[PDB]
Design a protein around this ligand. Structure first.
Ligand SMILES: OC[C@H]1O[C@H](O)[C@H](O)[C@@H](O)[C@@H]1O
Ligand SMILES: OC[C@H]1O[C@H](O)[C@H](O)[C@@H](O)[C@@H]1O
Lengths: 830, 830
């Protein structure tokens, strides 16, 4: 275990000897690079320790596969979990730098996008920390999604450049690479097994990222696959010929798999690439797992032991191919027969949902998947047939309607025939979500109410057939990154009033703040802390949004994928209402009615999704005018933070007073931002749905602001729109007209209101009930103004959010996965 | 300065902490990787030392630009020059490995091809060793030329894979990258200077490879440029659209510059790429140099000082663009006017000619170059005009014919007009060799007789105008790589019979072997050593050529570009003659007359060059039959070594008895293989030309086997063929018929002999006088048989070759460059 003295040397060493810059000066990016290399060294000691202990013990290991990991930045949580925070700070002093400066150089790992990505990253922290043998498998996306620029003209995209110099935290494993095949033909050989020959051949090379646990040695792995083709494949004859672009083809169409995350699938080309990406992950991962299982088994190898040595968690329907791919490996390659392979598959694999609505579930073209993964469609089919037979045996051909209905609901293959049937152009499709719910031994939703839908609607029939499979694993977020490290002031207070530093682990200790929520001394330190955080954010918003703002206003934050269902538009409209009102009142009354706010927006809109980009533009103009109005001044600001990601969240969240989770009700499965917020003492306005429902229950009904129509009514209210019974509120009408008047200027918005107006239509009719929720919304916002004025009350609510957030530690989530699905036990590393 | 104890730790560290493999086992490639990382560390100490001393002193630095660097393997010369050879050996013991094993894992740096490449690498060794402030600039070719496979069907190409895992010896410098532009337009701005806007934009990122000097700290650099485009440029809109291959375009056509060396220029596309490669090097290099000059200058900066602080050596006509490119930087960017810029340019830049014949000299399409490099053709033109004016001022308008002739010979622009002229469709071309001979202050050839041609033929008229410019710098090769490290047995003997280990530096000490060339004791140790070396080669030829051979035969080596001018088939034909003869005589008589031989062939043929590939096939079949003939057995073997490169040379050369340098006379400028051979105690058969002429003079006329028509006669003898006077030797006729008979079997040869036969024609007529030299050749080969039998005589000759090779140390060459062209002095590093 080192100290500042030793680390100063560790960094000097790496700067000189593991260099990526010239020796001219020790600038900031040099300093970061060398610092991170130092940290790795430490991480690799513990990584190899964990590897050894895991090898010897050959215990059950678990495997979280995710199309996205939103790792964020590594340094601060790294030296935090290694407890060397102090030492690195002091080390850098000696070398003419400081920690925060250096931490600033590090780009977020653009390995993910949203909550499903973050949930993965949050889970890893929990697993390492809790000493559970588990790894994460993902793709190594070179250019992420995009770097968001907020130009005068709204949002614009650029390729993320986080790998320009390369990531210091990663370890390439040139001996870990697997073969991945696409297209081709299948032929049965004289052993009676299938052989999948021909098509395309690419390699998947492993890059390990060490995840360290807090106050433990357990250092697990995020193994990231990266695709290429062996240099053999470079076509010399063609290159020398003159066909350079031709000569590249194999490498071009191999690397492209790992270029970007969620590549636009309007083209067939894009759908192909998407599928490539899913399979690559499922394949290269399972092959690595299987490899490791064998190694650890030795001479004495038994495939009955595989599910007792391995569990695979499919994060959504993207990893679905794990089911047929494992089948494929167990049968075609390892030799086992259908029953053995299938039994093992189910015992191993499990599905985590993440999606509410049935049309949000991933489906594929049968013809497409057939062309790309012949062998896999074969197996899929066999499973579907297996299934029709299950569905028929249980039930039987009573009430043909019952039977027939069930068949179409549950079948994996949409628009297909039955191998035999009784009873006395449609595009052929493959339902990945069905495959998952049959292939896995466990299906779970991500919050009470989410897991309820899946049970009683989305997979209703599968609940009937296999009730045992359905459970729930309410989401969480890591206390380390989201309290201890993102918000040190908060931490000092917590540690104090609890009496140990142990809440970081034993986070049920937050509840011990309840008896002190009224204590005025505690409220003082609380406000002082929040403020402190806010003062940091001021400087941030200055450099990033070029708008100067005041600490002493309320911080009202909404940060999520920009989307009509997320309804940032409802929020900005509530902003515009307050603005219209404030103009219609003199200076003095203006200051009396509305509490000062800084309204923070952020998050990305998919480049193709026009309305969403229109929303980004809207907000940016609202802010343009409002923030440059001598008449308003500092009573209202509206900023949009460019390129929202983990770094930003780590900064805004600690300093938030109010945060908005105002999705149309019944649509959000869970959400995880809202947990980070409640943890950081923030108060939540939102609809009743997803995690919001539990957070409210835990924090306190009166310490969480609620509004809007509830999930069950929505169809009622849309029906109301469809018939023409929704009478809009006059305040709603006001806002729209006020904008039309061109208050925000030369950009015309008729399109944007366009979406909301009319009773019928694809794009018309306000599917997401902005107009309908709007009244209770703004009135709720009045109750926040009101609450904020009563700072003794406000601050109590703040403290109660934190003291209620404990259940939302991902540590609780992982224990539950680990005990109830994976049956993995903790391995302690000496 | 470390020891085995410390290095064991250094390697353990790197294997674990700078890893590129998983922690599972310490295999060979792991062991090599970690070992090399260790060595780097040492190299970087001394690299940074050299950098500091150079910075402070800001003395004249020199710069060797080469389209190719044939670095080979680094490890053995690295730990050799650092004198840590012992320590690394012992270190590896402790870790369950041995040095040679580990050295075997390292691929040769595929950064070059031929002698001009090797000469560069050899020069670097000399410069570091002799403490001269100089660097090397080259491109970082990802896939080299090709990996040569010698299949049943002859030679076949594969892309070199030396960067699959990446090179441990390189240091990326992410802060060292320059902008390179192609195409575009030029417009004059309001400052009166030219502005080269638009076209293509790519980055050139530096990779440093440390060259350590023997028994010094001076550690210089081979800075290798590597091209790419900033991740910004990745077209998201297009990728998400579906046009993946489109989205890549910029990166594809940026990286392609550094894909392969000498990419086939049959296509226009290929010519474009070739030019791109030359410019990239000239530009990115000069920008780095200029940058460094400025840095070192500080506030007090004077461009008159530039040529007194810098010299640029253009290795052949590939770096020609350095002249206009420096002009461009000095004028358009830095602001200086024509005269200042030009004077500096000439003072800085110098040309080394590596080419005999005038049509072997590099020319370009005017239209091509003035689409890609507009600004550069402008400057070129200005220089040519400057030149016409020079040519006219010296030489009055007296002899019109004289004047007009001269104009067309010396002008840079072939098939152009004169800005005004007196006197009372041809494709427009640009002559890079002329540009070089005008732009530089120094032109030099690579051997006496080569430099004589350039003076008195190729640049005859330029000799008249600027005699001072012409000198000679006879080639050399490094004693370190080519005696001390490739051949340790030889070294032990040398060190012994000389007083000291100092010959490695003070290599004139080899001459001390002359007294003692007769000494029988020395001859014993000599033969013992040679043999030892040969025993290594036996095992090598076994694994790579799959032919078992005996040490006790004579080793007859020919290894060079496979080419009709290099002959090769004269030798293989001389091989076939001996074979035909041996069959026509009984076992017993056969074993007199012919001494046992192993005839080694090797080297690559360009994939397009059909005849050359036909030659590779020929040899491989000759060997096929001969080596599988119970009747011959071990009196004759013929092998072709696949993938001849530095590693191989290092192995064959020490173990050679005879080596062949039998190019058609007057064609070889120099050659460098023949110097490494004479150094290693080998005896040379060859034609009178290139370095052969000096080697013979130095080693001793009677210790070098000579034959063939001499350089002056060739045109005589070709004229003789053209008229039909040649009259072939009956022995020549024999061989051809014997092969025709299909002795070597099912592959039909005709068309191979096809080249040699006939008196007129493109492919006919034996341009290279195989048939004509053949008689003296084979008869000379008889004199080798004869000499080899007299082992006292033979071995004396062997020893005299070594004792004569001293003048051929590249150390002598570099001193000469350094004193006579560069005016650089040695800087000692404390
Ligand atoms: O469960 C992880 C996340 O996945 C989805 O994208 C949902 O929108 C959200 O409800 C949830 O937080
Ligand atoms: O000098 C460098 C080398 O360049 C060329 O490859 C010539 O063939 C050779 O004569 C010379 O040794």
């Amino acid at each position: 275990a080192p100290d500042a003295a030793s680390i100063t040397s560790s960094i000097k060493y790496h700067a000189e000897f593991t260099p990526v810059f010239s020796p001219e000066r020790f600038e900031l990016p040099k300093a970061f690079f060398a610092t991170a290399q130092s940290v790795r060294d430490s991480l690799l000691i513990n990584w190899n320790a964990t590897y050894d202990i895991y090898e010897k013990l050959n215990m059950k290991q678990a495997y979280y596969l995710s199309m996205e990991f939103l790792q964020g930045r590594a340094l601060l949580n790294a030296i935090g979990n290694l407890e060397l925070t102090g030492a690195f700070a002091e080390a850098l002093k000696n070398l003419g730098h400081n920690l925060e400066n250096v931490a600033s150089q590090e780009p977020d790992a653009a390995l993910g996008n949203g909550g499903l990505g973050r949930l993965a990253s949050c889970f890893l922290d929990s697993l390492a920390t809790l000493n559970y043998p588990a790894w994460g498998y993902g793709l190594r996306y070179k250019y992420g999604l995009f770097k968001q620029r907020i130009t005068k003209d709204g949002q614009e995209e650029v390729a993320e450049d986080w790998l320009e110099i390369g990531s210091p935290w990663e370890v390439v494993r040139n001996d870990v690479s697997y073969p991945i095949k696409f297209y081709g033909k299948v032929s049965t050989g004289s052993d009676g097994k299938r052989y999948w020959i021909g098509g395309e051949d690419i390699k998947a090379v492993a890059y390990d990222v060490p995840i360290p646990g807090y106050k433990t040695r357990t250092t697990i792995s995020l193994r990231l696959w990266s695709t290429q083709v062996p240099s053999a494949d470079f076509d010399l004859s063609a290159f020398n010929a003159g066909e350079h672009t031709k000569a590249c083809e194999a490498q071009a169409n191999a690397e492209k798999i790992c270029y970007i995350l969620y590549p636009g699938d309007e083209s067939e080309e894009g759908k192909i690439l998407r599928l490539k990406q899913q399979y690559t992950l499922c394949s290269a991962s399972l092959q690595d797992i299987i490899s490791r299982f064998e190694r650890r088994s030795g001479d004495r190898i038994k495939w009955e032991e595989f599910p007792e040595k391995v569990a695979v968690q499919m994060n959504d329907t993207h990893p679905t191919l794990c089911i047929p791919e494992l089948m494929r490996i167990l049968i075609d390659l390892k030799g086992l027969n259908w029953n053995e392979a299938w039994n093992i598959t189910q015992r191993t694999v499990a599905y985590t949902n993440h999606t509410v609505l049935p049309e949000a579930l991933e489906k594929w073209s049968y013809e497409l998947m057939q062309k790309l993964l012949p062998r896999h469609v074969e197996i899929i089919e066999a499973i579907d047939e297996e299934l029709v037979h299950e569905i028929v045996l249980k039930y039987g051909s009573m009430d043909l309607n019952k039977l027939e209905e069930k068949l179409t609901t549950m079948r994996i293959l949409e628009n297909f025939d039955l191998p035999s049937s009784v009873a006395e152009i449609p595009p052929k499709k493959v339902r990945m979500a069905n495959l998952c719910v049959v292939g896995g031994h466990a299906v779970n939703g991500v919050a009470e109410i989410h897991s309820e839908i899946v049970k009683e609607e989305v997979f209703n029939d599968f609940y009937e057939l296999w009730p045992e499979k359905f459970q729930n694993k309410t989401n969480g977020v890591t206390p380390r990154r989201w309290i201890r490290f993102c918000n040190p002031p908060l931490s000092a207070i917590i540690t104090k009033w609890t009496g140990t530093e142990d809440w970081v682990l034993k986070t049920e200790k937050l509840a011990e703040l309840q008896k002190f929520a009224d204590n005025e001394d505690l409220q003082n330190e609380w406000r002082e802390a929040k403020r402190s955080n806010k003062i940091k954010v001021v400087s941030f918003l200055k450099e990033k949004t070029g708008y100067s703002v005041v600490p002493d206003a309320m911080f009202d934050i909404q940060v999520k994928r920009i989307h009509e269902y997320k309804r940032q538009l409802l929020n900005i409209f509530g902003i515009v209402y307050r603005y219209k009102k404030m103009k219609e009142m003199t200076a003095a009354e203006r200051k009396t009615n509305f509490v000062p706010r800084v309204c923070i927006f952020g998050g990305k809109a998919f480049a193709t999704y026009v309305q969403a980009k229109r929303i980004v533009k809207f907000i940016t103009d609202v802010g343009a005018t409002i923030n440059h109005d001598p008449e308003i001044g500092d009573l209202l600001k509206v900023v949009f933070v460019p390129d929202y990601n983990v770094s930003v969240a780590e900064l805004l969240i600690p300093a938030s007073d109010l945060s908005e989770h105002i999705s149309t009700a019944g649509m959000e499965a869970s959400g995880t931002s809202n947990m980070k917020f409640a943890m950081n003492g923030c108060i939540q306005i939102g609809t009743l749905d997803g995690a919001n429902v539990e957070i409210r229950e835990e924090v306190g009904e009166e310490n969480f602001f609620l509004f809007g129509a509830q999930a069950h009514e929505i169809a009622g209210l849309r029906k109301e729109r469809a018939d023409g019974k929704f009478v809009p509120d006059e305040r709603f009408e006001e806002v729209k007209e006020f904008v039309r008047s061109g208050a925000f200027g030369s950009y015309n918005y008729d399109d944007l209101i366009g979406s909301l107006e009319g009773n019928e239509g694809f794009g018309r009719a306000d599917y997401f009930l902005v107009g309908k929720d709007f009244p209770s919304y703004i009135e709720c916002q009045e109750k926040v103004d009101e609450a904020y004025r009563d700072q003794k009350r406000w601050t109590t609510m703040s403290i109660l959010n934190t003291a209620g957030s404990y259940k939302f530690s991902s540590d609780r989530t992982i224990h539950e996965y680990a005990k109830d699905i994976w049956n993995i036990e903790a391995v302690e590393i000496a």
